[PDB]
Design a protein around this nucleic acid. Structure first.
Ligand code: ERY
Lengths: 64, 97
RNA sequence: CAUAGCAUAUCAGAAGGCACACCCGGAGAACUGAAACAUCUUAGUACCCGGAGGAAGAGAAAGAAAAUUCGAUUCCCUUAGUAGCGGCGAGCGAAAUGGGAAGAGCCCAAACCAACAAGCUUGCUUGUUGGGGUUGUAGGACACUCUACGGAGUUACAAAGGACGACAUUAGACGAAUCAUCUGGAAAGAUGAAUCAAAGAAGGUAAUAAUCCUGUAGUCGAAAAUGUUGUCUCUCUUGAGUGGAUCCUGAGUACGACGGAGCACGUGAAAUUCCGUCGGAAUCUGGGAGGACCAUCUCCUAAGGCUAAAUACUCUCUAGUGACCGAUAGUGAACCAGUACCGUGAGGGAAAGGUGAAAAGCACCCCGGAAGGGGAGUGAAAUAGAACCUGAAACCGUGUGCUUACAAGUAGUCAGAGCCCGUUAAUGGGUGAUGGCGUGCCUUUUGUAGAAUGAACCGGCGAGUUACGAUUUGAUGCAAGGUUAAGCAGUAAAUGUGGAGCCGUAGCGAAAGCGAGUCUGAAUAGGGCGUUUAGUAUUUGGUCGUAGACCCGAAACCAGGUGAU
RNA sequence: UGAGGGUAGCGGAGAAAUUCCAAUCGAACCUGGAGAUAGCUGGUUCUCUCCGAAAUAGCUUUAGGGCUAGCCUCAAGUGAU
RNA sequence: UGGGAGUCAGAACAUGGGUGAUAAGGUCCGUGUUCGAAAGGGAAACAGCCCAGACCACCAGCUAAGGUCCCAAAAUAUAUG
RNA sequence: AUGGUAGGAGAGCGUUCUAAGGGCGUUGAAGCAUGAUCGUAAGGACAUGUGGAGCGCUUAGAAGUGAGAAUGCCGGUGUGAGUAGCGAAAGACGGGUGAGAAUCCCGUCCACCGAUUGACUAAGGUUUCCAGAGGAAGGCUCGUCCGCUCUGGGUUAGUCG
RNA sequence: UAGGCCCAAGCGACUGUUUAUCAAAAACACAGGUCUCUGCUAAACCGUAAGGUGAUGUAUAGGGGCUGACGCCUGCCCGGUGCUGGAAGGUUAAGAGGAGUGGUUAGCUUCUGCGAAGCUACGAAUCGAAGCCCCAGUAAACGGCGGCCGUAUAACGGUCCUAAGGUAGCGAAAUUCCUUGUCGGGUAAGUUCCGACCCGCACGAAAGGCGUAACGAUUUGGGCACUGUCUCAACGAGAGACUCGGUGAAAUCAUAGUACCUGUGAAGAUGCAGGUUACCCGCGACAGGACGGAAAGACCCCGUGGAGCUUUACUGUAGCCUG
RNA sequence: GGGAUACUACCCUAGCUGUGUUGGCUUUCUAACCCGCACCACUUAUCGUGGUGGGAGACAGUGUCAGGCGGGCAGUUUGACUGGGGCGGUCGCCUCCUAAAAGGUAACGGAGGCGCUCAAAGGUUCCCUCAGAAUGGUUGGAAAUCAUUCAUAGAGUGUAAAGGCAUAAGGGAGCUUGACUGCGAGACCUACAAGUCGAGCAGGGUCGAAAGACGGACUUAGUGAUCCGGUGGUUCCGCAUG
């Protein structure tokens, strides 16, 4: 039958134009006072899923 | 599965929501309109008949990517500023349906 | 008194067995996955019970939706592995829309009217019968207005019950056309010369047959029959339109609280739909729905019922098909099969095919108690003789050429006299006095001659496969375009048709949205993703995912039964 | 001690031993779920050619398992790095 | 850049070190080699030591490590102790 | 340039079946057996015997496509090996029958059980009962014998249960 | 054919019963005690329930727990836990009351708070029985019966703290680490046995203490009788055995022409090196090796494998109590 | 005076009229209901049905809801490293040595620390500079304070150790809050997740005369994802519309 999609990844990541996956950043949503404003604003910058992780999680998002 | 190390899609946080009633528009650029003749009046049905648009999703939208080099009148739902400008520059009109 | 209850007459209405494969209800697991486990999952699965049936179930809006709307139900393809649910983990997973198969809306209660009997005094009520009518941008009764077999429809809603005009026209019958020679035990084979074909499908006949037989194509055909098909007697429905002002329009119902279950939804805001316990309404100026709740709008009118088709399965039956098996295969069972046999019992459950064309199946003689045999004879063949096609290897023997009783051995290998033979005839074969070298195979291991594992020998059987989806390579076609799915016509094909849908032609952003740019930012700055061409359809290989997923192997868990001989 | 009977597995019987319940019992036997699951052991069948490792960091209810990196191979491309 | 893997039990020797007892064919790191996965010659036999990397024939030759009395190829060689 | 285990890549040999074409076969197919043959390998021919009806070749296409090991399953057959064993007990002789006698029949003697190796009756078994015939198989040897085989017979109730 | 006997210690009173198939006993039962529950549709138990046992019985009865004839006895602690009872001091869910607070509306100023009438979701002021807290009792209920320094609560002293700190009688015991404790008896010689001592690591009074006639296929020590048990083996009888005739398996098995020594090596060699010995083939005997056969080690570790039992492990639950 | 009787729950000390009716306490009644309750008939029959009499009685029993108890029963869990396992000990981060002159590098190898603190111990502008030693003196701890000279960081630096510090990074004083907003070419480290440093650009500020310095402390520890839930803003979205 059809392949099924990993929903937790689906509502965590999106697919760019070429083939890449754009993610959100961890170490947010909680204590920042220990952190600096630099860390705060820099954890707002987006990043891509690494290729080493793509080699593992490719099939989970084929229909994305 | 990473052997019990927390997987990537639980290390990472979720974000966003999906708009269930979202408007998507069939896209067409100026470089596609050059196949027509000057003075012609193009419409969505004429686009579909010419095969430039396979599917009218929520309307048709005209974008200013290429070069027109023509003169015609257009009737569509939405336009881009550059598109309307480049239509009127060579001569022509844009009528929002 | 009355009926229970009891006692008679008539009828046969049910029980049991289903094919529990499919369908509907009641009840309802666990192993398992989550790399433990409890919510979850396995799964409303397995098993049990009850019902019916040839189908069952559902079904005609108190709907689906927000267009300017839509077709009662069911089924197929898509929407889409989307939206959503989720220790937001494992995983679960729609709907509308659209394209299609099949296409069917009918009846009650209540109003109201006319009769019937009892109470009552025939006024009213009660109940019985009959009409009448069952639907919303409101239908019917009363108020208002003028028509019925025109059409004619038994698949519900009435019926011709009809002369009704091939069940399949089915058992069945007919059904063209060949001779010779050679080999042979026997020709259908070889050679040569002819023929039929709406018949060259197939099988038998002493070997391989279109013309030898049964048959085939095709034609003619009768009972139970009718194909259930065409005017088909009766009977049908040729409508009566406006306002709806008044009356009616399904009560312990809807709805609510608590506890639960089912809906893709984890029980909670549950919107929606069901069970139990408690409460408990409105009546057309009404009531319900449109994912808490309020208002405006849109749609509908519950608490009454029936309903064909398309759909699901096959213990069976008829006619057939196969890049399915061919006796350790294929049904457990080609034969004596659910049988010998095992077990107290529930239950488990085998092995076992082949003489030859024809039985012509060995008259007779000899040895022998007979079994066995040797002749003779049948036969094409008897090392084809019933322990009967072919007849492999292990294993058991009899004969022989070379060789061996001073020798230490993974038994071979390289060298090499002597002796014997004479080939797919090529710098051949068999044996091997003697010399040199040399601790089997497989698996598991840092490392195995290993005193680590496995194999007595031989033969046979015995393990990455298929479906669906994803990804990537190669091939081909077309190319800013590429492509159909279901269905329909067709030989269970190719093909043709079918454009709902799918990918691509533009991305960025959580999103509104903007657009070759967008997001951030107060700012265009700076930076991130992007542009500054090439995809798409089928197929080949590789890999992955879901399914038992390369094969054998647990202790155990659960459900239903069997046993106190 | 005999003949008839009774008690049935989440159960029964036991002058009590985890003892007996058809040569079996710390939970009988037969069928089915079921091809349960098995990060464990064993096995996995024809030939030649080219190349050719590792037994290591790091995380892990993790230690004889697994994931990513390292090191192998095949194909495209850049092209002195 | 992408397709496909396997591996995560390592062993000895030499050298630098911890530990141990300036013990272990011990154990733990680091630097090299070999075995693993490597036949051949030598070390008597002997995975890890020395030499050296087998495409296949040849009753041809030159060498390495190790050797030249016999087993068993080659000096009972020379010269000096 | 060409040692090589996990492993990656490539090229090939064979097996069954199908399509098409072209062929072989009672003047003897496939299978089986032998051989001193060909090919770098998997493997392919030829000749002769046996056998007595189907089978190759070329190109392509599909797979139940190749076994030496799984304390694997099923059948045959060995080794141990002429080995262990032949299941408590007194037999001897004569005569007979017979192809054949330690083992069968008859006779004499001897011996054993003797609150039993005795005689009845229930349960259970179900024709093992009786006459003839028989020696293929069964009998732990033999066998002329038999609870074995074949043929044919046999169970009688008012009072017994 | 037909009882061996005596003396002395333990355990158990006795007869009986028990692990079919390695345990027959000191283990179980027992008759007697004791505690507790139950006033009859009794309690208790089986069952979803209905119906049953208890019992065609009725506190001199029935169920359950501990102990285990008989005799002498059965000591201290109610602080903790359990059970019973009481005061009822206070705390609570469902529930009855709705005081107030907000979403929404022509409703009121239309720039805006009476929330009014109303539809709606929240909501304390009260109470609300069990339970819980508290008090008392109960030890033949669960349990406990000593720390510290003079000294080996040993003797008496104190204190530590809770509720108390071992009465009788026993005692190197089925209990004693040091241990073959010490002394005596018995023997030529006594890690055992008997008697005595107490320094009871860690005895103790119904998970009963001490003692007891009778009993025992019980444990233990000593003596008499008697003997091949032994010094020390010998001879005979049968059956297997061995030879002959008939019949004729099995476990095992990679192939086998299968020597020894010293070494080597996965560190213990028929198979490797160097030597030593050794004509080919049988039969009867033996058991040193083939790490012999037999059984995918039951000891040990491992598996995010199972099962059984336990509890103040987590989560539930039949059921019980109260509303 | 210690409250405290204006008006007002209002009142203990009070006795006190009955009310549409409603909502609690305790008795008594009976027809519901219950009697393994007595007699009488079905009956053949103690089951059961029915009549009469007696008991009990709106309690009990049963249903639904709630709370407490509940190894009686069930499903499950009960870690790893480890010179076998167990007992013991440890599990994250920082600093030295081991470590073999880049970096990195193991052991149940050797030593120690962290799970913060500070509104000045932060920023800026100005000034200032050790102990110890003797010397010598009221005090004298011999040395506390005071005074001259060498002292080379042996001083001191909030906190372990190491690397650094007189540019003082140590010690005081005056102002002040840059312990700001939005980005950041590029680099370090790295399996991933993460972690680290950054010139400079806009904006708007503090100190200083000014150049200029300030995106927290001499540097390196002083935490921990994700899901869930809560609070505030918002230009976002959603149901037909609000
Ligand atoms: C009579 C008939 C039986 O004889 C025995 O039981 C003898 C008497 C055991 O002696 C022994 C006797 C006794 C003391 O052990 C020595 C006891 O310890 C064991 C359990 O049984 C034997 C030999 C055991 O071996 C030993 O088993 C041990 C687990 C490991 C031991 N190991 C060293 C290789 C091994 O030799 C082991 C279990 O029986 C053999 C298995 C195969 C059996 O069960 C076999 C088939 C038995 O039925 C046997 C033939 O029938």
């Amino acid at each position: 039958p059809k392949m099924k999609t990993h929903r937790g990844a689906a509502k965590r990541v999106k697919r760019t134009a070429s083939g890449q996956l754009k993610r959100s950043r961890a170490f947010t949503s909680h204590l920042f006072a220990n952190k600096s404003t630099k860390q705060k604003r820099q954890l707002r910058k987006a990043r891509l899923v690494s290729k080493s992780d793509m080699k593992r999680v490719k099939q989970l998002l084929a229909y994305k | 599965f990473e052997g019990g190390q927390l997987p990537l899609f639980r290390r990472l946080p979720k974000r966003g929501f999906t708009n269930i009633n979202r408007k998507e528009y069939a896209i067409v650029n100026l470089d596609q309109l050059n196949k027509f003749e000057d003075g012609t009046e193009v419409t969505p049905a004429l686009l579909v008949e010419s095969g430039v648009v396979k599917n009218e999703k929520s309307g048709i939208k005209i974008l200013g990517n290429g070069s027109l080099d023509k003169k015609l009148t257009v009737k569509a739902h939405k336009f881009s500023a550059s598109a309307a400008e480049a239509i009127d520059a060579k001569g022509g009109a844009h009528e929002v349906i």
